[PDB]
Design a protein around this nucleic acid. Structure first.
Ligand code: ZN
Length: 632
RNA sequence: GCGCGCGCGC
RNA sequence: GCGCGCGCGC
């Protein structure tokens, strides 16, 4: 359960060796518990390995909050018995606390890295040598300009700067090292090297002496990809779609601020992109108007479901779902709006059924799926099969379809001890796994996995992924054969070259250009404000002042409010024209003042003296006379 | 908002 | 580079 006493498995003992022997290691092991337990061991040996009058300090880096939390607990619980001081710091703690002190008085610190990057940048923590051990969760992210790398740039600057200063052991954990954009083993192997260089790892630990034991707590099924296709012509999706347009235009006219309700533009019926757009519009409207909408949208949703049922199951099943829903409102409480929609449907109802019964509108997708089930079960009749589909709706359709089938009468299906096939949308020891048009992709011997998609891209993407997993396995298998001394030297060339381009590629101060400039909405090219009215908060954030602007923009209220540096996210802000409605940035309370904060990418820079129109995506890029903030 | 990573098109 | 998305962090 991850939260108690455990017997380490041989394979984890093996994985830890190189860490325990003191080398900087990358630990490539498959997903889950594995890594946690392993990083518990290392950590336990690290702080134990010390002689009296000496203490270790371990820091553990984690990318997501959920991970920062689940790992703060595990570490706390586990090292509780032992007497060590354990904490974490994340975005939500970090606000106003003596970060040097928290480290100073702690044996295990859990962090999200952007904290450390921030605190080394300030000088509040002068050096990494305070730490004895660094652990990088999901360490394959150590590249490019990621926090992990910023940390290492600091470390490698201390290491190669020829400066002492001791430095910590560095460990990274991963299920999968990556291969970047490599096209063959040669390049993959270059990629993994540069990766090791960045972590100053001299060893990559994987499981070798304990394969029989790993390959049984982590299948690893047989991967089968199987292309299909939808029907030749779907004249049913034409009917329901026309009904959706119809009911959308009916909601538009009762609402008219409709499109503005969400910036989820270019929506397409019968896509889950649409199902969200629905929800975002229903939560958004902040009420006789809002109650009219809930009803119209509650109808478009079932319509949307319906299409998704048609496309992956059969029309008979889409229709049924719809007859059901409509039945359920003819059965009270009934009002004009609802009786309207029910009528506009009742009108197609006859035609929908002709298209439904039409022999040439069966779903070729289902015959394939069928084949697969007859193929696999004739091999083994005691097979227990699991079926993943996209929507809770499609779950029933597929169940009904199977029950209502003479070609596969042999199944006993179930859903969300006697049953022998299970259908589902979310959540093992089953022996047959089928991802049917599942979108998707997320998550003892002889086991098979089938993906079935009409999409080529997916099938082709997934096959590229399999070729990379081999490319990756082989490379590792072979750099594992290099003698460490040789490997450490290859790494050092890399570290060196990489260090050099960091300093070289830096650039002097940028000479600021006094000339006043217009900011123009990037979309409609209407005037927004002037750079004269712009001010800079905390060196990083930009506001305008004065009311000439207080009405150049409109403010729909944010659906994701948060606080950062200081100050609260309250609203998104938008170009005030009715057909432009470009996204301008946001509007916050800061200290005492509600103020707008704007992103330059939402604008064109036109010099007034000349008319020249430059475009920036980052304020760091845009060099003008920036002025800090206060009374006004 | 800022920062970081990833994908799609051109 | 521009356009349009996703996920993540401060
Ligand atoms: Zn505009």
């Amino acid at each position: 359960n991850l939260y108690s006493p455990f017997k380490p498995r041989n394979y984890q003992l093996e994985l830890a060796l190189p860490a325990m022997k003191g080398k900087n290691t990358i630990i490539c092991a498959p997903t889950g518990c594995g890594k946690t337990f392993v990083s518990l061991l290392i950590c336990e040996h690290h702080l134990k390995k010390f002689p009296n009058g000496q203490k270790g300090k371990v820091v553990f880096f984690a990318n997501q909050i959920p991970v920062y939390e689940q790992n703060k607990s595990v570490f706390s619980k586990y090292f509780e018995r032992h007497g060590y001081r354990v904490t974490g710091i994340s975005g939500a703690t970090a606000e106003n606390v003596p970060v040097e002190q928290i480290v100073e008085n702690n044996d295990i610190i859990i962090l999200t890295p952007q904290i450390l990057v921030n605190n080394l940048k300030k000088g509040t923590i002068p050096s990494l040598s305070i730490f004895t051990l660094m652990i990088f969760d999901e360490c394959h992210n150590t590249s490019k300009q990621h926090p992990y790398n910023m940390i290492m740039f600091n470390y490698l600057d201390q290491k190669l700067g020829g400066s002492s200063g001791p430095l910590p052991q560095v460990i990274g954990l991963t299920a999968s090292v990556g291969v970047g954009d490599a096209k063959n083993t040669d390049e993959a192997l270059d990629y993994i090297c540069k990766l090791c260089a960045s972590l100053d790892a001299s060893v990559i630990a994987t499981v070798k002496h304990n394969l029989e034991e790993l390959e049984q707590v982590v299948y690893k099924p047989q991967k089968f990809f199987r292309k299909v296709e939808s029907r030749i012509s779907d004249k049913f999706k034409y009917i329901i779609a026309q009904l959706m347009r119809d009911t959308e235009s009916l909601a538009k006219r009762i609402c008219k601020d409709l499109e503005n309700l969400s910036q989820i533009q270019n929506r397409e019926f019968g896509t889950q992109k649409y199902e969200q757009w629905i929800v975002t519009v229903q939560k958004a409207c902040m009420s006789r108007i809002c109650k009219a909408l809930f009803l119209y949208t509650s109808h478009l949703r079932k319509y949307n479901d319906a299409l998704i049922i048609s496309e992956h199951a059969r029309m008979k099943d889409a229709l049924d779902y719809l007859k059901d829903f409509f039945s359920n409102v003819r059965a009270a409480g009934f009002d004009e709006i609802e009786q309207d929609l029910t009528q506009r449907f009742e009108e197609k109802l006859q035609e929908l059924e002709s298209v439904s019964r039409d022999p040439s509108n069966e779903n070729p997708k289902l015959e394939d799926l069928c084949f697969i089930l007859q193929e696999e079960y004739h091999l083994n009749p005691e097979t227990i099969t699991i079926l993943f589909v996209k929507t809770r709706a499609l779950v029933d359709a597929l169940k009904n379809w199977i029950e209502g089938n003479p070609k596969l009468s042999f199944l006993k299906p179930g859903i969300l001890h006697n049953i022998l096939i299970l259908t589902s949308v979310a959540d093992a020891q089953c022996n047959l796994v089928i991802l049917y048009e599942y979108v998707g992709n997320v998550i003892a011997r002889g086991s098979k996995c089938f993906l079935l998609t009409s999409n080529a891209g997916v099938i082709e993407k997934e096959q590229i992924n399999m070729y990379k997993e081999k490319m990756m396995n082989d490379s590792i298998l072979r750099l594992q054969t290099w003698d460490e001394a040789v490997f450490r030297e290859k790494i050092l060339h890399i570290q060196t070259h990489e260090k050099f381009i960091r300093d070289s590629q830096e650039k002097p101060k940028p000479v600021p250009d006094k000339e006043n400039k217009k900011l123009l909405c990037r979309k409609c090219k209407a005037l927004a404000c002037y750079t004269a009215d712009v001010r800079v908060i905390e060196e990083c954030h930009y506001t305008v002042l004065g009311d000439a602007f207080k009405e150049c923009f409109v403010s729909r209220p944010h659906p994701k409010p948060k606080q950062f540096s200081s100050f609260e996210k309250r609203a998104k802000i938008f170009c005030a024209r009715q057909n432009c409605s470009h996204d301008w940035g946001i509007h916050v309370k800061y200290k005492t003042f509600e103020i707008p904060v704007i992103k330059i990418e939402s604008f064109v820079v036109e010099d007034i003296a000349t008319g020249v129109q430059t475009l920036y995506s980052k304020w760091k890029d845009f060099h003008f006379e920036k002025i800090p903030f206060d009374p006004a």
